[PDB]
């Protein structure tokens, strides 16, 4: 039970963290966007 729970907390936190960075770093262009420079988010304003 010592190894069962101690390893789980490490592995669960590590695998969840890799999920977070994968989702974050997929949208990293949007998160570091600047309103001055053109971006894909702006182009939807052209459509309406």
């Amino acid at each position: 039970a010592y190894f069962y729970f101690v390893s789980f907390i490490f592995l669960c936190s590590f695998l969840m963290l890799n999920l977070f960075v994968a989702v974050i770093m997929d949208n990293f262009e949007y998160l570091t966007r600047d309103s001055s420079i053109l971006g894909p988010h702006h182009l939807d304003e052209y459509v309406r």
Binding site: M16, F20, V23, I24, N27, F28, Y30, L31, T32, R33, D34
Partner: protein, 48 residues
């Protein structure tokens, strides 16, 4: 409730903060401090 409320919001908070920190690094005043740091290190290597 836990997945949406706690794990999904934590993902956005890390995502938004990380994007802000990337933009802050490339600020003109912040870049100049790093350029001073790089030059000061180059002197130390040659001086040694």
């Amino acid at each position: 409730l836990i997945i949406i409320g706690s794990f999904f919001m934590l993902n956005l908070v890390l995502g938004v903060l990380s994007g802000e920190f990337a933009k802050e690094r490339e600020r003109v005043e912040n870049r100049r401090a790093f350029l001073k740091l790089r030059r000061q290190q180059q002197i130390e290597r040659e001086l040694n």
